[PDB]
Amino acid sequence: SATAASMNAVKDSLQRGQSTIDVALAAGDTITDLLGKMKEKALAASDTSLNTASFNALKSDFDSLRDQIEKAATNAKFNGVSIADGSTTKLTFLANSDGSGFTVNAKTISLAGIGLTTTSTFTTAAAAKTMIGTIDTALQTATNKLASLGTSSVGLDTHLTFVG
Amino acid sequence: KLQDSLDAGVGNLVDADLAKESAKLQSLQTKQQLGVQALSIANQSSSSILSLF
Amino acid sequence: KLQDSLDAGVGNLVDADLAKESAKLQSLQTKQQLGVQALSIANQSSSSILSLF
Amino acid sequence: ALNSINTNAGAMIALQNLNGTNSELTTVQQRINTGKKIASAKDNGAIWATAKNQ
Amino acid sequence: ALNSINTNAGAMIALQNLNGTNSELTTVQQRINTGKKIASAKDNGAIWATAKNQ
């Protein structure tokens, strides 16, 4: 019966892991929307028939959206621990009444994590042609990381049911 | 034409069929009310032991 | 001729296509009525616990 | 023991099945509120990522 | 806890999706009232400034 009490101890840790992953997923959805909008801005600015006074507006929009991504990424902490800022390499939760763990790797989605590089813009109408591809790769890798996070959350749920 | 096609495709990928959820929802509400009555029936076990003494 | 062209261009830049908003508006009114019925359905959870006691 | 006054498996199993039905109801209500099968990244990661990028 | 009487996540998530739909309705109604995509400087700053100057 001591072991059944220990299982009662394990279930809360599994639930806390679920919660942290939900916070990360919310922040990730916001970040993916922002990345789509940034791609639209960069694509619009890659035009060489554009006036000199519209390029500056599109650049400032781009810069605002990048700062937004950074804020949205660093604020996604639950209980001080997070798996989307890039602070630690992995989180280990309880999965067995003897201490064996459930491992969830860290999927950084901050500007450094997806390779965006903060304070990275396009000064001319030619750097935008490559910024398009940079934002495409960034969006791809961000969506891959969020899919992995969702899979891990489903795994935590299944194991919690089994522990019950 | 291409943008319309892409929107329709994404919807084809990730859109639901609400007609099935309606039926499933009705069945599940009935099943939950039934599971509650079943649990309440099972709870009253062991209540008969008092009559023995 | 030039003033007419400039007005037409500015309109090309910042004018909407109302036909799309009509469709989107209809879909959104239906979706909001549905989201209200869904919220009302979700609210009545936990109401079954009383029957247990 | 079939006469034990400290425990009964019937209540536990009834609880487990009731909780299963409640989880299924949660999923269906989510499907109704959002209007789509894969809403978040928990439903299906691969298809969700594909739809975002597309 | 799936039986908690103090809270429920389903209601919160349903609220969030309902508010999202309401915001989208606000945007579409604005589009209908004014007759144009970029009406104010909040819609799109660059294009709005361009149209003013032009």
Added chain:
Amino acid sequence: ALNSINTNAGAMIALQNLNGTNSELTTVQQRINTGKKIASAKDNGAIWATAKNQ
């Protein structure tokens, strides 16, 4: 089972017939919008190709 609380074939069959009617309505509305039987290449490939070439 005629008393099963987990399923019912009547709802499924009613759904199928309703969807059939909806598809027929889609086809008729297309016919009304375009003004012709064979509009795209999906309606009838042979006649559509013939009309294009002619």
